[PDB]
């Protein structure tokens, strides 16, 4: 079984917004579908529940009447469909099949009235190992993903959360450890990617 | 109508086992209860079911050291033989006439885990930001165990307060603890200091990484 959620960004307040989930490996139409969402650092909060092939649906009260589900027994997938969203909107939907139960990965809404905002990425260093990483600075919203080398490089990769800096834009950094020896003659790319900007860098970091 | 309530937190050894108990509200004494386990910084995870009947199915992968049981309007979750890795979040959550409720959720510590001293790493600005004109100093703190520390900065020996930004600590993969402090200057503060330094304090003792212009 897999559940993977589409659709999270930015949403002006006021503003609508379409999420989708993909399930496979079980027959979906049998199964009530749910929606649940978790706002930063708070708990799990129920969102809405469908019955398998959609005659019986249910919301929390603090979503009726703005958001709508739905599915599409044929294409396997469940969808969220959000108008008049609120600030406090903002959080981490997920979808689930609880009858074992399942969840999908998480799909990121952010309601703010703050623009979007691509990273500029900096290279940091290395001065028998060496840390050498990537500084993702000034974006907004989240989320950002970092590989190295294309994904070639898994081993000694850390990539830190992102800090919520006071001018409301994030910045977080990606760090690797390796062989000194290696300083002069691997190459070492970070590959950051925003997808709410559109911005793709891949940013080559050299010894000094 | 139906109200599942969690204790805020709750710890045992390494080793040993733990119980966490949801309770029920009035009205509802014959529902099943699921819980999902969450690590930091990701996506829930299910465990398991428990119906009143004190039976339990389970999900797949989770170790047989995981178990359930019932008792009143109170249901468990025991896990036997605790490791660093269930230092987590715990929910619980049932289903009653299309309506789904959680549980507000434990949050589990594991005790008798070994110190784990910080490994910090300070780097400067990079030249490319200082062409535009901008200085971030990048202080990364990771491998701590348990997940509290303080960042200070100093500029040479005085502290530092204004531009510092500090992340709240965060689980591992491997079940110990990241954090990260950032330090804006301007290029002309960054230039006319000796140094700058950022200092981790973990478990009542400091240490310092130092960078140059």
């Known amino acids: 079984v897999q559940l993977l959620e589409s659709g999270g960004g930015l949403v002006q307040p006021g503003g609508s917004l379409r999420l989708s989930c993909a399930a496979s490996g079980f027959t979906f139409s049998t199964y009530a579908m749910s929606w649940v969402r978790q706002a930063p650092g708070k708990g799990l909060e129920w969102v809405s529940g469908i019955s398998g092939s959609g005659g019986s649906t249910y919301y929390a009260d603090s979503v009726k009447g703005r958001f709508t589900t739905s599915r599409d027994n044929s294409k396997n997938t469940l969808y969220l469909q959000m108008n008049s969203l609120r600030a406090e909107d903002t959080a981490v939907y997920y979808c689930?099949?609880?009858?074992?139960?399942?969840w999908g990965q998480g799909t990121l809404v952010t309601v703010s009235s703050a623009s979007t905002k691509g990273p500029s990425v900096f290279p940091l260093a290395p001065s028998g190992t060496a840390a050498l990483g990537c500084l993702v600075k000034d974006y907004f919203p989240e989320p950002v993903t970092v590989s190295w080398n294309s994904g070639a490089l898994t081993s000694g990769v850390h990539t830190f959360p992102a800090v919520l800096q006071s001018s409301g834009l994030y910045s977080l950094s990606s760090v690797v450890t390796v062989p000194s020896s290696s300083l002069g003659t691997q190459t070492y790319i970070c590959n950051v990617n925003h997808k709410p900007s559109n911005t793709k860098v891949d940013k080559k970091v050299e010894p000094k | 109508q139906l109200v599942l309530t969690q204790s805020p937190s709750a710890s045992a050894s390494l080793g040993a086992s733990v119980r966490l108990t949801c309770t029920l509200s009035?009205?509802?004494?014959?529902?099943?209860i699921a819980w999902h386990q969450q690590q930091s910084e990701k996506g829930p995870r299910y465990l398991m079911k428990v119906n009143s009947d004190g039976s339990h199915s389970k999900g797949d992968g989770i170790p047989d050291r995981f178990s359930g049981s019932s008792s009143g309007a109170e249901r468990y979750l025991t896990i036997s033989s605790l490791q660093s890795e269930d230092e987590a979040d715990y929910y619980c959550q049932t289903w009653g006439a299309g309506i789904l409720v959680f549980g507000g959720g434990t949050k589990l510590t594991v005790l008798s885990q070994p110190k784990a001293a910080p490994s910090v790493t300070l780097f400067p600005p990079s030249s490319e930001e200082l062409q535009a004109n901008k200085a971030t100093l990048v202080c990364l703190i990771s491998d701590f165990y348990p997940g509290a520390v303080t960042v200070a900065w100093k500029a040479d020996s005085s502290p530092v307060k204004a531009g510092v930004e500090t992340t709240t600590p965060s689980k591992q993969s491997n079940n110990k603890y990241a954090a990260s402090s950032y330090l804006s200057l301007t290029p002309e503060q960054w230039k006319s200091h000796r140094s700058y330094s950022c200092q981790v304090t973990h478990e009542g003792s400091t240490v310092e990484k130092t960078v140059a212009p």
């Open positions: 009035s009205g509802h004494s014959s529902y099943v």
């Open positions: 689930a099949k609880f009858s074992r139960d399942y």
